[PDB]
Design a protein around this ligand. Structure first.
Ligand code: HEM
Ligand SMILES: O=C(O)c1ccccc1Nc1cccc(C(F)(F)F)c1
Length: 405
């Protein structure tokens, strides 16, 4: 057996959070080490680079030599989930220019500032309805299942034209896919969603209807400009991202705000601070490092360090968002700071399609919680919560809460 010291210069990555709003201990070390890049070891023993500094992260996310192609043999997979989805065509999150733009542009019209503004009545109605329901159902609740997840689920389903009557099926399948720890469970969940979306497509060909899925069927599919299987993958990406991200931000924001009561009280007293507070929470909670993987198709020199063609690179936006040369006192939550330029949504051609929908949702959500349940508090200590591992979207699967009856 091993009898020598075990220190490594390529630590295992990713790490798991122990506190919902602080860097894992190993990540603070990466944050402090000079240089834009650091070697890490992935779950299968393969070495990859992580990007740990803010401007270097923007530069590399903007560099077309870093490909988003998940089918590449050298793509930096962080768990066995990745190996599962090989047979299926990728959604545009896994495409590079020029194919990336042709597919992304098929969906952008649903996310314009004008459409998002027009969605405010629906978002407010959905938020207040699930809130009406949770407050009436009992003195305590799981915020996740009763509020954080159904709200963005109903909103994105309406945008897509996915009937919410099937929500128990597709919400469960979405959870199994993003939180899968092995390839087989991931493949099963993906096939479940694919079969469901396939049936929805056939129905739109018979009976044209509203929503982005209906529009893609009636236009691009009918012109042969998207493959049926690509349409499934695109709808699946938007469905899952639209659900899982906002839900995680809601639950983690509640935990974080309750641990910072002075700032939460200031937020309640001046609602003009909400948009800025949402940006700070996005920066600080950075829930989507899982989306930072890239593979180099050519050598890239980064401040003296060399990324070789064929090497995997993960842009760790949570660490980059704690860069003190950009955010003074970066580990402090400050809803009054300028959190502009943060990387929680990425940067460049793949920058989050839904970012302004997410911003609208989180603004409406925080205002609604402060208006309708100002006495909201956790029903258990923070120590008793269970955080998801760094191999998935950050968050909590259950969040017990209570309030003044
Ligand atoms: C709520 C907080 C959210 C966070 C923190 C977040 C984070 C991210 C990040 C970091 C990326 C970049 C992936 C990459 O560079 O490979 C991304 C892309 C994307 N996100 Fe978001 N997201 C959020 C909400 C949403 C919502 C509500 C939707 C609605 C469907 C959405 C849809 C997408 C899509 C489609 C992409 C792929 C864009 C592309 O490849 O061109 N996201 N997101
Ligand atoms: O990344 C894929 O290929 C993907 C595929 C199908 C469904 C969802 C997918 N991605 C995903 C799932 C949840 C959250 C986010 C993101 F963080 F990027 F928004 C991306």
């Amino acid at each position: 057996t091993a009898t020598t010291p075990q220190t490594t210069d390529a630590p295992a990555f990713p790490s798991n959070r122990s506190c919902p709003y602080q860097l894992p201990d190993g990540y603070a070390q990466l944050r402090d080490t000079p240089g834009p890049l650091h070697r890490v070891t992935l779950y299968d023993g393969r070495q990859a680079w992580v990007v740990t500094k803010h401007e270097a992260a923007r530069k590399l996310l903007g560099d077309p030599r870093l490909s988003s192609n998940r089918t590449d043999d050298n793509f930096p997979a962080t768990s066995p989930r990745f190996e599962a989805v090989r047979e299926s065509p990728q959604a545009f999150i896994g495409l590079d220019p020029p194919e990336h733009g042709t597919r992304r542009r098929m969906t952008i019209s649903e996310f314009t500032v004008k459409r998002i503004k027009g969605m405010r009545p629906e978002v407010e109605e959905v938020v207040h309805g699930f809130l009406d329901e949770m407050l009436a159902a009992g003195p305590t609740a799981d915020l996740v299942s009763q509020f954080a997840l159904p709200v963005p689920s109903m909103v994105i389903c309406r945008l897509l034209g996915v009937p919410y009557a099937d929500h128990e099926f597709f919400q469960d399948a979405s959870k199994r896919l993003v939180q899968s720890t092995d390839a087989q469970s991931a493949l099963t969940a993906r096939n479940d969603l694919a079969g469901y979306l396939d049936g929805l497509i056939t129905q739109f060909q018979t009976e044209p209807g509203a929503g982005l899925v209906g529009a893609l069927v009636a236009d691009q599919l009918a012109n042969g400009e998207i493959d049926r299987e690509e349409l499934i993958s695109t709808a699946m990406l938007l469905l899952i991202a639209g659900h899982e991200t906002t839900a995680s931000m809601t639950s983690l924001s509640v935990i974080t705000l309750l641990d910072h009561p002075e700032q939460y009280a200031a937020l309640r007293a001046d609602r003009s601070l909400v948009p800025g507070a949402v940006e700070e929470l996005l920066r600080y909670l950075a829930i989507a490092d899982i989306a930072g993987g890239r593979v180099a198709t050519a050598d890239i020199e980064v401040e003296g360090q060399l990324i070789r063609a064929g090497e995997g690179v993960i842009v760790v936006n949570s660490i980059a968002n704690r860069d003190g040369t950009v955010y003074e006192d970066p580990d402090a939550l400050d809803i009054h700071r300028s959190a502009r330029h943060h990387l929680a949504f990425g940067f460049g051609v793949h920058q989050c399609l839904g970012q302004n929908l997410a911003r609208l949702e989180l603004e409406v959500i925080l205002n609604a919680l402060m208006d309708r349940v100002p006495t909201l508090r956790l029903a258990v200590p923070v120590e008793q919560l269970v955080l998801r591992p760094g191999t998935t979207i950050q968050g909590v699967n259950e969040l017990p809460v209570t309030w003044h009856h």
